[PDB]
Every structure is written in C-alpha cells, then in structure tokens.
C-alpha cells in the first residue's frame, strides 16, 4: 500500500517492530549516555530552534527526544512510533503532565496523517554502520511535513572508512569456517562445503570495538546531508576510496564508523562513534576480506564500497579493493542485516 | 494451503527457515557432541532397525542423521528439508558418493511427496523446553509415510519439571526493571513504566543451566509417545503437579528439562538434557513466579502447567501454583518464543 510496505518485506517489518517494542531495547538505547546526553545537549543548547516551534519526532520510542524538545520550549510535538512502544510513550506523557504539548501518533511515519506542517524534525534513526534498518529513508520521507527552510536534527551524517589489520579477528572467523573443511566428521566428508562456509562467515560484518592502532591509513569520509537528500538517494550508495597507506602489512578489511551533526542556530553539536571517542552502543563495524591484501607503507589502496538497499531493511555491501602498486585485488559481498555481534 | 501453512504465521515461518538456512546454525547443533554422538550411537547400535531398510529423515539440515542411517546400512533414505540448507545437503550426498542411497527432498514434510512408505522415521525435532518450534508436530505428521508397525527414532520424550529456589535470579529482574524507577532521567519521570518493565522480564523464560542444589522437590514428568500421539495432542498440553517439598524455602518458579529415548530392537538409548548430565545446547529452562511462594519441607506445592500452542511456532505458558497447607498462590504467564538466553 504505502511507501514503507512497498520497500519492506512482511517478515522483516514484523521482526523489526517486535524488537523495538521491548522496554529492554529502549532502555539499552536510553542508557547510552554519550548518545542520550548529546541529543539532550544539542536540543537544549539550541533552544531558539525549539522555543514556540512545531516539532516532529520520527520513531519516538519511549518519547525521550520529545521530552527534550518540550524542555526546550516547543509549542507542539508530534511523536510518531509504529511499534507497541507508542502506548508506553503515551503513559509517560500523561505521568509527566505534558498532554498539552506532546501528541503521540501510533503508526508508521509513511502512513499516518499529521495535522499541520512542522518547523523541525528530530529523530534517532542511525543503525549500526549508520545505514542498517533503512530508517534514514523514513527520516527523509518525513520531510513532506517540513515547512520551507525547516531544520533537521541531526542535520548531516558522515561515514568513515579505513583499512585495518587484525590477524586474530581474521583467524577467529577463518577457524569457525574450517569446521566445514573436515573430511571425516563422525565419518562424514564435509569438505565440499568449505567454500560455502568461508563465504557465509565472511559475508557477516563484525560489530565490536577495537584499538585504533589496527588502522593502516587515514579515513575516507562520505557525507549525507539530511536537509538536502531525497529518500531515493539512499537506494544505491556509492563510496569510492583511495587510501595512502601509512603502514606496511596485511590489510584484513575495512573498518567503519559514523558521526552526525546537529547544525543549530546557536551552535553545532557532534555525536561521534569513532574508535578514538568513548564507546557507544553502536560500537564500530568491520568488513573482512576472505582474501587479505599485502601492502607497503606509501602504497595506495583504491576501490569502491557500494551499498544496495534491499527489502529486509538493510543493504547488500560490495567492497572491491586493490593495491595499485601490484594489481592485487579483493572482491567481497556482505549481508549487513546479519552480522557477527562480537561484543556480546 | 497445507497443514503447516494453516498453523503458522507466514512471517514466523520466513524467520524460522532463514535461521536454519545458515551453516553456522547447523554447525552449532552438529558440534553438540552429546547430541550428535548419541544419535550416531543409537542408530549404529540398533543396526538391524536400519540394515536394508527404507528411512525418512524429517528436517535433515546438513544431512548428518541420514549419513548415520547409511553408516548403519539403510537401503534408501529420504531426507526432507524446508530451508535452503537442502542445497548444501545435496552437495554432501554427492561428494560422499551416496546419490544411490540418500535422496534429498527440498520442502516441508507437510507438503512434499515421498514415492514409497518407510520402515523408520528419524528426526531431531526437539526445541528448548522440548516444545518450542512446534516441530514435534511435523515429526508426528510424518507418520502418514510410516508403514504399519514402522518405528520412530526418538520413540518417546519426557519433560521434567521441578520447583526451584534462586533468590539472586529473582532479584535480578527488579534490578533490571528499576532503571524505570527514576523521577528524573535527564529530567523525565520514568516511574509509571516500572510495573510494565517488571511484567516484561517475568514473561521471558530463562534459558540457562544451573546447580542442582536449587531444586526443592523430586521432578514430575510428562510423556509424549511419538508412535501413538496425534498432532492435535500437542495443541494444548496440561501438566498437573503435586510436589512434595524436600526443602524449606522460597519457591521462585519451575525448572524444565527433557529426555528422549530411542527404543530399538537391540537396545534403548537415552539422550538427556537434565541438569545432572553434561551440558547440551538446549541447556535448561526456568519460568519465574513474579510472586514467590513460601513452603516448608513436608508441604505440598500443587497446581498446573498449561501450554497452549500459537501460530508463532511456540507456546503460551500458564503456570498456576499454590502451597496446599497455607493457601498462598501464584499465577504466571510466559511467552516461550521470546525467552531470555541468559547464557550468552
Ligand atoms: C534490525 C535491528 C533492529 N536489529 N535487530 C537485532 C539487533 C541487534 N541485536 C543485538 C544482539 O542480539 C541480537 C540482535 C542489535 C542492533 C543494534 C546494534 C547496535 C546499535 C543499534 O542501534 C540502534 C539505533 O539506536 C536505532 N536508531 C542496534 N540492532 C538489531
Ligand atoms: C525460531 C527458533 C528456531 N530460534 N530462533 C532463534 C533461536 C535461537 N537463538 C540463539 C540465541 O540468539 C537468538 C536466536 C536459539 C534457538 C535454540 C536454542 C536452544 C536450542 C535449540 O535447539 C534447536 C533444535 O536442536 C532443533 N531441532 C535452539 N532457537 C532459535
Ligand atoms: N517508519 C517508522 N515509523 C514510525 N516509527 C519507526 C519507523 N521506523 C522505525 N521506527 C521506530 O523508531 C525507533 C528508533 S530507535 C530510537 C528511539 C527514541 N527516539 C530514542 O532516541 O531513544 C524505534 O522505536 C522504531 O520502532
Ligand atoms: N516442517 C518442516 N519440514 C521440513 N523441514 C523442517 C520442518 N521444520 C523444521 N525443519 C528443518 O528441521 C531441522 C531441525 S534441526 C535438525 C537438523 C539435522 N537433522 C541435525 O540433526 O543436525 C532444521 O534444519 C529445519 O529447517
């Protein structure tokens, strides 16, 4: 029917809203102090962006960002939420005596009707590696409700990528896969599935944190401007790169992280998930090559990271990389939807 | 329209078969040594139940059990598998040079055709707490292909339950929920949702192992005989109990585990997930009471554990219990499909 259901398979949506419908998941995000404190600070230090203004909160969850908008003096806040968390949010609005200012609207932002246009849209729509969930497209879709010259909080997003070396990680994944190399598992020859097995394990991005000393070159940055982007821009995301290698060694893959900026009238505030910054519930994300690349300090590692949105609220990631000085090439395809959550 | 599609919400089925389509999930079950080792022994040591026989493997996964049937000398094994793991099973049959004896049939056992009737059914259809996944119904459905007087491996399943005391596990729930008991979380009073957070945690069965010293009475068992049972017998499972308390203390809930028996012509072999036995991937399961019950040694703790099948491939669990000598009672509702995997 809607823009949402057209891009989203049934089973994915059901599973996705069940996950966010749990108080325990909302708590996990709320208790990321760097995340929640930075949102509150961006909003309160930019109070003139909220004072007597009309606000839309995309995917309000517990209602937390809407309470921050209210604290900053907003006249009216529409808090849209498609999971069963909406009913919990309406309980909090009543117990906090803000029924006159915060209006919970249950359902998908692609499907509801808002009574008026808004001055500013707030949301926390970043998945791991920024793009997981495809909730950035809901955030962009919501611009149908934004007044001309309205603002977006966050305003921009930067994705960073850098080559890394981590033989321990590589061998950890390699070792699980080589279960399927055994020629006599309880007398059975599994070895014909070894290739399929290496592919499966290496298709999984790795979600955890790491020491910055694994990084082999300065990060390449790709920027999404939320004020200017249309949701269609996010169907196919193409990030070319050329790294000037600062260290010699084996390149085991690319590491990803992201920052968003709240570009307000009074000040710009940054929220970062960089590995040089304090840890957040996003950690960082690594895509391994099953076939690692040898490079020397001063080489250039060049290629393309391509993200193709899929119906399961995620992206098919291809990473083609090469060491220019040798013509050594690595081609990889990752399933962002199904990663190894190594931090657990 | 099949028996399977009628009892199963489409979206639960998609998620279910995706999960089993991964080699790492198959690998997880395979590497449970007690599990895979015991299947192998039970089949090989009952070689006359297999020698020159026709076999059905219900949900073959990688094909592992079917290879054991072949090691035991079966003439023809039909291996049925609904996930994309069926492709991989096919590869292994080829590379193990058994195309003449193992026939992989892709699809649901409720929907495929077998070209002949079989002598024995083999399967591993046991979920956590035995009943999760509702695959025991697929196994029983498969008896439409069994020759009169054919056998089933496993032949019977016993679920055991027993009351437990575990003050620290009980406390953990309030510690977690009390996140919400704050009047000023970044300025927001979260207190109104504390009761809801408590109810959420108590609704999740706890999947983990424990020390046998927590158990307060001898277990009661409930037996399914796979040779005799019909599918409809598993839609509503009523387990009455009268525990004669061996220890005085505070009863915090019921612990569950299960055993299966392979009743062959040569010998009966048992596979136990009891807390007195080495750990398996099934662990054990505990259902908490939000109100604990005081009992002293000698008392009788009586009531009913009722499992009601649902269209998400699992059960709604109702546990009602009382201490006969005092009349104090506790009533609990759990969602077996969404437990707390405490062991992770
Ligand atoms: C499809 C999405 C909803 N999803 N599904 C499962 C899942 C997830 N886990 C964590 C480990 O347990 C299994 C599932 C973590 C995460 C996750 C991990 C790190 C950061 C994160 O950020 C969510 C944003 O705050 C939402 N805007 C989310 N996302 C998960
Ligand atoms: C819908 C069912 C298939 N399902 N879905 C997820 C899931 C699961 N996990 C593992 C923990 O992280 C989340 C998912 C474990 C298990 C699980 C846990 C313990 C034992 C177990 O045994 C499976 C049987 O051996 C299959 N015959 C399976 N089942 C899961
Ligand atoms: N299309 C859509 N319409 C409405 N809500 C959505 C949505 N897509 C995702 N959501 C909701 O958006 C939330 C993102 S998580 C962030 C929750 C909260 N604003 C906070 O910052 O703490 C989830 O609760 C999810 O259910
Ligand atoms: N109704 C059904 N029809 C066919 N296969 C099914 C099924 N329900 C579950 N399965 C398959 O049954 C398997 C259960 S796990 C057991 C796998 C394998 N027999 C082993 O012992 O290692 C999964 O691979 C699952 O996809």
């Amino acid at each position: 029917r809607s823009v949402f259901s057209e891009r989203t398979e049934e089973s994915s949506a059901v599973q996705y809203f069940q996950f966010y419908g749990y108080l325990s998941q909302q708590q996990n995000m709320m208790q990321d102090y760097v995340r929640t404190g930075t949102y509150q600070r961006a909003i309160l230090q930019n109070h003139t962006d909220f004072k007597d203004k009309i606000v839309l909160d995309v995917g309000c969850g517990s209602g937390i960002l809407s309470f921050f908008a209210a604290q900053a003096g907003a006249r009216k806040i529409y808090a849209v939420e498609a999971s069963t968390m909406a009913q919990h949010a309406e309980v909090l609005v009543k117990s906090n005596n803000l029924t006159d200012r915060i209006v919970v609207i249950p359902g998908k932002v692609e499907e509801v009707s808002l009574p008026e246009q808004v001055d500013i849209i707030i949301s926390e729509p970043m998945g791991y590696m920024l793009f997981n969930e495809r909730m950035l497209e809901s955030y962009l879709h919501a611009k149908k409700y934004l007044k001309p010259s309205g603002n977006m909080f966050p305003t921009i997003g930067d994705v960073h990528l850098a080559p890394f070396t981590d033989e321990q990680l590589y061998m950890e994944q390699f070792t699980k896969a080589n279960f399927w190399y055994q020629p006599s598992f309880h007398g059975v020859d599994l070895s014909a599935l070894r290739g399929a097995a290496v592919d499966e394990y290496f298709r999984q991005p790795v979600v955890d944190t790491f020491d910055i000393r694994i990084l082999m070159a300065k990060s390449v940055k790709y920027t999404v401007n939320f004020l200017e982007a249309k949701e269609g821009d996010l169907h196919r995301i193409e990030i070319p790169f050329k790294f000037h290698m600062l260290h010699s060694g084996l390149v085991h893959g690319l590491a990803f992280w992201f920052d968003v900026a709240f570009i307000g009238s009074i000040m710009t505030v940054w929220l970062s998930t960089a590995p040089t910054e304090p840890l957040t519930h996003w950690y960082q994300v690594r895509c391994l090559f099953q076939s690692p690349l040898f490079a020397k300090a001063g080489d250039t590692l060049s290629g393309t990271c391509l993200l193709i949105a899929n119906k399961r609220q995620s992206y098919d990631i291809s990473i083609v990389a090469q060491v220019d000085q040798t013509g050594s090439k690595s081609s990889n395809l990752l399933d962002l939807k199904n990663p190894f959550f190594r931090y657990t």
Side-chain angles (χ1 to χ4, degrees), chain A:
Chain A
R1 326 213 135 94
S2 73
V3 164
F4 187 95
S5 68
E6 296 282 69
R7 75 160 109 116
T8 314
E9 67 153 49
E10 171 70 7
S11 185
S12 191
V14 172
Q15 205 164 154
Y16 176 90
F17 294 110
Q18 170 166 339
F19 182 85
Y20 281 120
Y22 286 103
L23 294 158
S24 62
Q25 283 322 315
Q26 297 296 332
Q27 171 182 349
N28 188 253
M29 300 182 286
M30 297 164 76
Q31 81 197 337
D32 177 340
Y33 180 69
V34 171
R35 183 194 89 102
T36 303
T38 301
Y39 268 89
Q40 184 170 35
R41 186 155 47 80
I43 287 161
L44 304 182
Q45 298 262 57
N46 288 303
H47 53 266
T48 57
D49 289 322
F50 291 85
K51 178 59 181 178
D52 304 312
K53 302 267 189 202
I54 317 293
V55 180
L56 168 63
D57 183 353
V58 182
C60 74
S62 69
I64 188 63
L65 309 182
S66 300
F67 293 108
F68 297 159
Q71 291 158 11
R75 175 166 66 199
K76 184 68 73 175
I77 305 131
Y78 302 103
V80 177
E81 171 64 45
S83 81
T84 56
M85 196 57 50
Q87 280 60 62
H88 297 313
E90 159 76 326
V91 168
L92 287 182
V93 172
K94 286 172 181 238
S95 62
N96 286 266
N97 305 303
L98 283 170
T99 57
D100 60 328
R101 287 158 82 209
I102 301 177
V103 179
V104 176
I105 303 179
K108 302 182 186 62
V109 70
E110 298 87 349
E111 291 169 2
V112 298
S113 310
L114 293 196
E116 58 183 323
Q117 304 290 87
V118 306
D119 301 294
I120 180 162
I121 302 177
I122 66 183
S123 187
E124 199 273 84
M126 301 88 76
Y128 57 73
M129 198 180 138
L130 174 61
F131 295 112
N132 192 245
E133 310 191 7
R134 302 190 58 185
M135 189 181 168
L136 298 181
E137 293 164 79
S138 305
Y139 184 42
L140 297 174
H141 179 105
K143 284 198 288 186
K144 69 181 189 204
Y145 297 118
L146 189 60
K147 310 202 326 201
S149 319
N151 211 354
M152 301 277 282
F153 257 33
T155 321
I156 69 178
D158 290 333
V159 188
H160 289 259
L161 36 170
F164 73 88
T165 179
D166 197 339
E167 86 176 295
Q168 191 202 60
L169 178 58
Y170 180 88
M171 289 306 174
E172 165 177 353
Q173 294 307 74
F174 207 58
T175 292
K176 299 174 199 170
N178 281 335
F179 170 88
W180 295 96
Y181 174 87
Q182 291 171 86
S184 197
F185 180 74
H186 291 263
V188 183
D189 186 0
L190 310 180
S191 64
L193 292 180
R194 73 198 153 76
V198 172
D199 293 354
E200 189 184 295
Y201 278 103
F202 283 79
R203 198 184 301 139
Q204 305 190 263
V206 181
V207 185
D208 75 356
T209 193
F210 50 82
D211 197 291
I212 55 144
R213 74 191 58 170
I214 77 168
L215 302 176
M216 299 174 82
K218 175 172 289 180
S219 81
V220 162
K221 181 173 82 185
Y222 180 94
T223 297
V224 182
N225 191 322
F226 303 125
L227 225 32
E228 303 303 335
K230 48 193 69 148
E231 58 173 304
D233 301 340
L234 296 186
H235 296 352
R236 191 183 181 275
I237 300 150
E238 188 172 21
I239 323 186
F241 58 79
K242 200 158 188 287
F243 297 112
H244 295 266
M245 298 307 293
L246 293 167
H247 297 273
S248 284
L250 278 157
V251 178
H252 292 112
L254 303 182
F256 298 80
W257 62 92
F258 71 87
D259 302 333
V260 296
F262 300 90
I263 306 180
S265 294
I266 289 160
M267 73 174 72
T268 290
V269 164
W270 287 89
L271 170 65
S272 183
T273 66
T276 51
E277 296 290 320
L279 186 58
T280 77
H281 86 285
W282 289 284
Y283 297 77
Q284 286 89 215
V285 180
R286 283 180 288 172
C287 296
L288 290 154
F289 312 149
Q290 41 174 287
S291 321
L293 296 171
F294 179 74
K296 301 285 272 80
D299 287 352
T300 59
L301 181 74
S302 85
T304 298
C305 173
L306 189 61
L307 289 96
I308 299 306
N310 63 49
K311 302 279 209 66
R312 294 173 291 122
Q313 300 174 94
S314 200
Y315 283 88
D316 312 325
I317 298 161
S318 55
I319 299 155
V320 183
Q322 68 161 38
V323 181
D324 298 329
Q325 286 67 12
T326 61
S328 180
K329 200 147 189 289
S330 174
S331 297
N332 320 255
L333 309 167
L334 298 99
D335 187 32
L336 184 58
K337 194 55 192 283
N338 298 293
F340 174 27
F341 296 105
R342 190 175 190 237
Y343 69 79
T344 61

